[PDB]
Write a protein that binds this ligand. Structure first.
Ligand SMILES: O=c1[nH]cnc2c([C@@H]3N[C@H](CO)[C@@H](O)[C@H]3O)c[nH]c12
Ligand SMILES: O=c1[nH]cnc2c([C@@H]3N[C@H](CO)[C@@H](O)[C@H]3O)c[nH]c12
Ligand SMILES: O=c1[nH]cnc2c([C@@H]3N[C@H](CO)[C@@H](O)[C@H]3O)c[nH]c12
Lengths: 282, 282, 282
């Protein structure tokens, strides 16, 4: 196997963008679950369809939106590419690399996830302190292939992927919104989906020590870290994954969208305020 | 990656079959381990080689056998396609989908498996109450790719894959055969094989909570469920998988065939009687 | 998927080698981490670049070195092919099969690994008594595909992969070198890399019962066993994999090379002496 892309391609995508916009973003945001709205908190918002950008994986609704969120230069991904849609991981995470070359130095990723930790409840937000990359164990790692040392090393470390500074500086930000539910922290486990877990699979993931399970994010994290970006991320718990054979309930997408729009308020503000904890550059 | 097949192909395979036979099957049966004989309990038996069916994956001995088992309209698969033979999962489970379009509404799958639960013994039959899909965690899920909503949803649920009604209605059926060994129930774990587990791997699968391990079935289950079929399945425990470094014994295929023919009687009758618990349609 | 190679190709590679050298090796050695030096303990050393050998996977520095190590006919692989470089496993393990056809009957494999067992320390050598093949669970097994019974069976066993005789006969050899650190024994877990484990991943691998984690070896083991070779292997623990969020340390490649050259002495001698415990043939 190898990456369909050459260093020149990432480069060429960045230069194209660097000449179709004035924005010089510092922060990449990859939204999942009702952070769709974030668009309207941006100002000086310039949209580009994925379809117009040279080299961009080809989905539908997908766009890059540059602008300012709370005095920070951002680029947000609206719509993303998942492994379960059949993309190889080197297309899943193509954008992260285009970001690094745009000059971005931080990544914020968010997602929906089922809660495996029994404490959690629908609506909780969980900070990601760590991950378990199950597709990665088997070979599905976005860095598989020849390494380009213009991005990073052959063997990067992931023990420190999720910036400790950003995690404290996001706990602070939660107090100063006065919330009833407390901010959660924990391990996100990636699995490839697209079907949902059995009870027995749920039990497996709880025994491994995961707190939430989704079908994204980790690969973009690994590529971010390979590149030198600072990473911060979190999960909206949209459902408590089913764990006994008694329950007549079932995980479904209505539940996930339902919950997404429910936290739409909470989140856009939460992320928007977090912008101020991101140190400027120079 | 994507599926080599278009909705039109599945369709075209079904119509071909629908015009080469009078049978309008309600129940699909996918046999493993000495359910080879089931053929001769069928009546009005019409055979087709896999080789003659348009689009069918291409193996050797493989045939589709339509007919009546105990007053039910069946189609049985004799020989199946495994992941370890190098088939992509969208060929492994092509038949399940052809089945749905033939009008089938139930699936019965069976297989050989090593016993991980220490209770079990060679010759035991275990009902499948749940599975652990290890290839699925990593990306090897037969639904990977664009979803066709003519079969089902993007994100189907698997918490209820194995029909509870059918499982009670199969416990009943066991009493009324007067058996010395009791009917087992449990989690089947799929792994890709084709080599057999180490002791350390055995220990891993026991800690995850599996009761039996085979190299098939799960993918056909996931595709069945995606489609709306009712699913029922079980495993013939052909060997107690090796769990300490003391034993001089080793898992082997003679053991599996040996056991298969040993339960050939038990099983054909057991499945044949189970036919009456399958509610008719309309 | 299938193997790019035909039985004829392996064959053709062996015959080519059988006519470019007088050596008729009995023992294959696949070195990792500062067994680079072993070259100079060989005598009558004949080198071949990978680049000149028909059919050999194509990397850089890679060579086959035939000769005598302590009165045994060897062939050593200097440089090997990893899964994380993007090779399919049937190229990763092409050489093992060329070895079998050269007449080799034993395989010795070594590697670097992170220590998961808290007992271990940097510099320890651990014998491999067993493995956990995580890529294998998911489908990444080098035997995936049609079986050739000229090498072995459809379904070989791995419960006895690591020769018990060789493991005792290597414990002996350790006494008779008078070492302060004792020889370790344990389960090696393969994961695909190339990134290093998170803390949460470390915890997972410890709970599964692994003692060390690397990104090689297992596939060559499975193919060796499929073929009938005797296998013996071990790991140089080059780093204690990070297991709590407190530590400011991080796994890195300098640490691995650092440690490799540190045991270069210890190992070359250790392997060289082990040669005498390998029974001759006939
Ligand atoms: O309960 C769950 N189990 C497995 N995956 C998910 C996710 C997935 N995480 C992915 C990140 O966006 C997304 O595509 C979504 O479908 C949300 N909830 C659950
Ligand atoms: O002890 C075992 N370990 C792993 N797999 C299997 C199976 C596999 N299950 C598959 C379902 O037919 C079949 O191809 C068979 O080889 C039977 N016994 C064992
Ligand atoms: O701490 C670790 N974690 C995961 N893999 C490795 C290895 C890997 N094992 C592989 C066998 O040579 C090699 O390429 C190396 O990078 C050494 N140490 C560690």
């Amino acid at each position: 196997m190898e990456n369909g892309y050459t260093y020149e391609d990432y480069k060429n995508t960045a230069e194209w963008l660097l000449s179709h916009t004035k924005h010089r973003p510092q922060v990449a945001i990859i939204c999942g679950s009702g952070l769709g709205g974030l668009t309207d908190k941006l100002t000086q918002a310039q949209i580009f369809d994925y379809s117009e950008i040279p080299n961009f994986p080809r989905s539908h609704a997908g766009r890059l939106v540059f602008g300012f969120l709370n005095g920070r230069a951002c680029v947000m991904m609206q719509g993303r590419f998942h492994m379960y849609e059949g993309y190889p991981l080197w297309k899943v995470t193509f954008p992260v690399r285009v970001f690094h070359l745009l000059g971005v130095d931080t990544l914020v990723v968010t997602n929906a996830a089922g809660g495996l930790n029994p404490k959690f409840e629908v609506g909780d937000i969980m900070l990601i302190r760590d991950h378990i990359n199950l597709p990665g164990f088997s070979g599905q790692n976005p860095l598989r292939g020849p390494n380009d040392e213009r991005f990073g090393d052959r063997f990067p470390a992931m023990s420190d992927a999720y910036d400790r500074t950003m995690r404290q500086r996001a706990l602070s930000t939660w107090k100063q919104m006065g919330e009833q539910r407390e901010l959660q922290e924990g391990t996100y486990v990636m699995v490839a989906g697209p079907s949902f877990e059995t009870v027995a699979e749920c039990r497996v993931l709880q025994k491994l020590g995961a707190d939430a399970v989704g079908m994204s994010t980790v690969p973009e994290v690994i590529v971010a870290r390979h590149c030198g970006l600072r990473v911060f991320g979190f999960s909206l718990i949209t459902n408590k994954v089913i764990m006994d054979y008694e329950s007549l309930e079932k995980a479904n997408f209505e539940e996930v969208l339902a919950a997404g729009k429910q936290a739409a308020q909470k989140l856009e503000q939460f992320v928007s305020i977090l912008m101020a904890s991101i140190p400027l550059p120079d």
